[PDB]
Amino acid sequence: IPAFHPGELNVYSAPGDVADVSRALRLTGRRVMLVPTMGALHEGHLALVRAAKRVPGSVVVVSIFVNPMQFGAGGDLDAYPRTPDDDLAQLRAEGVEIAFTPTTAAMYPDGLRTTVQPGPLAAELEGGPRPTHFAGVLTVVLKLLQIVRPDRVFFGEKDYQQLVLIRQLVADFNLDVAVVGVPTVREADGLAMSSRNRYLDPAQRAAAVALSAALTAAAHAATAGAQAALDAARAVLDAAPGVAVDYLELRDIGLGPMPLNGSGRLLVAARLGTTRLLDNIAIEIGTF
Amino acid sequence: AIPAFHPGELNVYSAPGDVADVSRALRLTGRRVMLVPTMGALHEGHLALVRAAKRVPGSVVVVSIFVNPMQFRTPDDDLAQLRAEGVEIAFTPTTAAMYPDGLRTTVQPGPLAAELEGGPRPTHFAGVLTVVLKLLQIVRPDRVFFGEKDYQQLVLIRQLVADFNLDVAVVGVPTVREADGLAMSSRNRYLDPAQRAAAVALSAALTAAAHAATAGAQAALDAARAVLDAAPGVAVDYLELRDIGLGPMPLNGSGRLLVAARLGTTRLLDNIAIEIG
Numbered sequence: 048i049p050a051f052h053p054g055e056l057n058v059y060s061a062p063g064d065v066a067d068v069s070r071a072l073r074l075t076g077r078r079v080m081l082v083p084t085m086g087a088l089h090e091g092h093l094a095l096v097r098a099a100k101r102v103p104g105s106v107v108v109v110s111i112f113v114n115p116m117q118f119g120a121g122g123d124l125d126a127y128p129r130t131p132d133d134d135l136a137q138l139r140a141e142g143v144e145i146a147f148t149p150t151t152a153a154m155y156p157d158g159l160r161t162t163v164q165p166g167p168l169a170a171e172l173e174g175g176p177r178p179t180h181f182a183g184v185l186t187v188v189l190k191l192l193q194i195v196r197p198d199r200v201f202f203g204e205k206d207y208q209q210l211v212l213i214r215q216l217v218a219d220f221n222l223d224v225a226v227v228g229v230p231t232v233r234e235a236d237g238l239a240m241s242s243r244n245r246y247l248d249p250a251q252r253a254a255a256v257a258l259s260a261a262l263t264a265a266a267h268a269a270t271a272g273a274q275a276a277l278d279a280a281r282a283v284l285d286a287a288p289g290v291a292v293d294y295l296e297l298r299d300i301g302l303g304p305m306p307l308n309g310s311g312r313l314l315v316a317a318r319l320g321t322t323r324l325l326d327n328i329a330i331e332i333g334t335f
Numbered sequence: 336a337i338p339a340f341h342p343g344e345l346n347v348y349s350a351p352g353d354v355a356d357v358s359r360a361l362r363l364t365g366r367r368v369m370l371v372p373t374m375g376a377l378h379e380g381h382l383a384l385v386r387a388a389k390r391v392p393g394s395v396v397v398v399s400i401f402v403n404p405m406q407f408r409t410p411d412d413d414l415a416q417l418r419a420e421g422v423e424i425a426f427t428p429t430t431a432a433m434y435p436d437g438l439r440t441t442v443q444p445g446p447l448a449a450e451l452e453g454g455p456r457p458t459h460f461a462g463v464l465t466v467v468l469k470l471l472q473i474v475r476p477d478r479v480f481f482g483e484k485d486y487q488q489l490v491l492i493r494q495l496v497a498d499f500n501l502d503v504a505v506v507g508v509p510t511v512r513e514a515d516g517l518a519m520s521s522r523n524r525y526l527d528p529a530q531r532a533a534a535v536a537l538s539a540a541l542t543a544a545a546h547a548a549t550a551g552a553q554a555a556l557d558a559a560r561a562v563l564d565a566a567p568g569v570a571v572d573y574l575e576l577r578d579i580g581l582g583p584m585p586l587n588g589s590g591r592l593l594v595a596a597r598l599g600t601t602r603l604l605d606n607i608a609i610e611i612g
């Protein structure tokens with residue numbers, strides 16, 4: 048075990064350091080909570096931190112790691128926002144005791160060798176045109192789960208397809224961790240918080256309310272059925288200046304090879320200028 | 336509740352959750368959990384892994400018996416052998432219990448899996464590493480035991496453990512051999528007398544190579560080839576000298592010589608440590 052100062056933020060870069068500290072905490076009865084992030088923290092991330100915090104006896108580990116493996120080449124990785132000083136300041140303000148900030152060399156010392164191959168869900172929606180993205184996510188999350196060995200791991204409903212795929216990972220590899228989904232944090236007007244929102248200029252920011260407005264319109268229209276819900280969403284998106292829809296799909300909640308019934312998830316992705324935004328919402332069909 | 340466990344007796348569990356719960360409970364009581372993965376049909380080769388696991392102070396030995404459909408049966412007899420060895424846990428899951436959602440998330444091995452045995456069987460090691468990762472997470476052993484017999488499998492499991500940051504020690508156990516050197520395998524019984532006599536060439540070629548190695552890598556390889564060449568009906572699939580991690584052989588130093596061959600319809604493998612010079 049390296050130094051651990053309780054009630055203070057401890058920052059570890061070495062996998063072995065955080066693994067030792069986590070083990071030592073776990074052996075003395077603390078329950079270790081893990082919150083994977085790519086940094087540039089905002090209130091969406093803090094909702095996961097707080098959910099973790101409220102677990103009785105919890106120690107909270109927030110990982111910050113802009114994982115190269117889930118980026119496709121073409122400057123996306125270099126372009127990802129990095130604000131380490133603000134991130135650690137926020138974690139201190141939240142009472143988090145552990146930040147895990149690994150280097151690329153420590154996570155990938157052998158490059159890409161053994162990796163996780165996700166199931167067919169990874170080839171759809173976000174994965175359609177980024178066929179390796181979710182292998183990247185599931186590989187790093189598996190590694191983080193093995194390094195930290197948390198009792199529970201926290202993921203946002205914001206990245207709902209990611210959340211579902213993490214549940215598949217946990218189920219399919221018999222991982223002894225509880226996956227906790229945390230509801231999407233929104234701005235006052237409905238805009239889902241994201242580190243990419245900083246790339247919307249004033250006009251795009253105004254137009255971007257249409258994604259959440261479309262989804263919530265759809266959620267309410269859904270008493271009248273799937274077609275009514277989808278066409279409500281399309282009408283709002285269509286009314287929105289310079290929103291280019293990539294997809295809008297209503298699926299069963301597991302997003303799996305199962306047709307939609309009473310409970311679904313409506314998912315949208317759209318481009319505003321160069322910024323790709325995502326949102327999703329629970330949908331109940333024929334239910335008021 | 337935790338499932339029943341009778342110390343000193345063979346306790347058999349088919350449900351992953353059950354062996355998981357028992358393993359956890361035992362870990363907490365001051366046992367070190369040892370895992371020995373098999374596909375049943377046990378012989379002295381498997382028993383050497385068992386005995387290596389047993390000798391670890393405070394060990395409780397978990398032997399898994401599971402025929403993994405993804406890398407492609409004497410149940411009562413296997414179980415009696417384990418009882419005889421003083422094994423306390425056998426984990427005998429069904430395919431449905433191991434794969435309740437079918438094949439979905441899997442492990443994708445690195446490029447070593449496309450080589451050597453990955454030649455004729457390109458999907459084989461994905462199946463192995465997928466099932467071994469699952470057994471590791473179910474049982475959560477302190478140490479997991481594999482035979483040097485399947486050396487490429489062993490090296491790939493070390494890669495799995497390293498790459499996924501798994502907290503388990505991987506223990507390789509030396510190949511158990513018949514009196515004439517042939518590596519023990521359930522496949523040996525398929526050989527007719529001519530083929531069984533010819534089959535001694537694999538181990539003879541490797542051991543010759545090991546001793547020829549004082550004269551350098553080429554002398555070792557040529558020695559092995561000459562012994563394989565003295566045997567009838569032995570179709571060599573490969574004969575390769577690699578470093579101990581199965582990368583390219585270094586100029587001198589330690590390596591591994593691996594061989595595979597087909598005798599009629601039966602495919603046999605063997606391998607040996609080589610020290611160059």
Ligand SMILES: Nc1ncnc2c1ncn2[C@@H]1O[C@H](COP(=O)(O)O)[C@@H](O)[C@H]1O
Binds near residue numbers: 083092094206242
């Ligand atoms: N607005 C939000 N509400 C809830 N969770 C979020 C939000 N934005 C990001 N997250 C979650 O925080 C984790 C890290 O997000 P990221 O750093 O963007 O990869 C993921 O589990 C996200 O789903």
Ligand SMILES: Nc1ncnc2c1ncn2[C@@H]1O[C@H](COP(=O)(O)O)[C@@H](O)[C@H]1O
Binds near residue numbers: 375379380480512519
């Ligand atoms: N002759 C042998 N000597 C040492 N280990 C062996 C031998 N035969 C099989 N094993 C090991 O026993 C384990 C189970 O093999 P199997 O049941 O063939 O999957 C593997 O780790 C094998 O490498």
